[PDB]
Amino acid sequence: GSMNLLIMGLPGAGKGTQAAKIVEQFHVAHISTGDMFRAAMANQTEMGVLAKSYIDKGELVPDEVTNGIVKERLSQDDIKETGFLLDGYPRTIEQAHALDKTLAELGIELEGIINIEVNPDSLLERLSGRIIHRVTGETFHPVDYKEEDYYQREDDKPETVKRRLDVNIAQGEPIIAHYRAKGLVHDIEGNQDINDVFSDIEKVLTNL
Numbered sequence: 150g151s152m153n154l155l156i157m158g159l160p161g162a163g164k165g166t167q168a169a170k171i172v173e174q175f176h177v178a179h180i181s182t183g184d185m186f187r188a189a190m191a192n193q194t195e196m197g198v199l200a201k202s203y204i205d206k207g208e209l210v211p212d213e214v215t216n217g218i219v220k221e222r223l224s225q226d227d228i229k230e231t232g233f234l235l236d237g238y239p240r241t242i243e244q245a246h247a248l249d250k251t252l253a254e255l256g257i258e259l260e261g262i263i264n265i266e267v268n269p270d271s272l273l274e275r276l277s278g279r280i281i282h283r284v285t286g287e288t289f290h291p292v293d294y295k296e297e298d299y300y301q302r303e304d305d306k307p308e309t310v311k312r313r314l315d316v317n318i319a320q321g322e323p324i325i326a327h328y329r330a331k332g333l334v335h336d337i338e339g340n341q342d343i344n345d346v347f348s349d350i351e352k353v354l355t356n357l
Contacts, residue, residue: 151230151232152233152261153258154234155234155236155261155328156168156171156236156262156263156265157264157321158339159267159269159318160276160310161267161272162272163265164236167346167347168236177232177233178233179233180235180238185222186204186210188222189221194221196214196217197218197221199214199217216251219238219251235248242324245324259333260333260357261335261354262334263335263337263353264325264334265337265339266337266339268340272310272314273310273311273314276310276313277309279302281302282299283299283300337350337353
């Protein structure tokens with residue numbers, strides 16, 4: 150009955166799939182950054198219509214507005230009833246500090262953090278393998294009988310993925326340390342089958 154959770158993991162770690170499995174078993178509200186903003190705007194909340202005025206103009210959403218969005222979301226009814234699984238926020242240590250303030254104001258306590266760990270070299274190989282034929286557009290990872298008959302999306306080039314992973318690691322490290330120092334972080338080995346990863350998650354959550 151109700152749990153207040155964060156889920157964390159580097160790109161390619163399968164955070165999305167696990168979140169959906171967590172919802173199915175434990176009924177917490179899965180809340181990604183995208184969901185939160187889409188809700189605020191589509192449901193036309195006070196913060197949402199405010200956020201929309203920046204987004205429509207192609208401008209960045211200020212921290213003050215983002216923090217209001219979050220507080221608004223965690224203020225909803227479903228949060229009291231079912232708890233939550235916050236996904237993608239906080240993204241920086243500053244947002245972690247802002248979140249803690251909001252949770253304290255709301256009288257809410259974080260109960261656990263699911264941290265899916267996968268070796269960044271394994272992630273790199275998994276995210277930067279996709280290769281595409283020039284005229285048939287056939288996708289690979291596997292074949293390649295001709296090195297020059299293929300190309301990669303910019304998003305999928307090893308240097309691009311490597312930078313993405315490095316930035317995500319650097320931004321996430323102080324957040325993980327911040328909450329680990331409070332015993333809230335539970336490391337899950339992510340290099341398993343989907344059902345085995347979730348199996349370890351299930352053990353953690355039922356024993357909270």
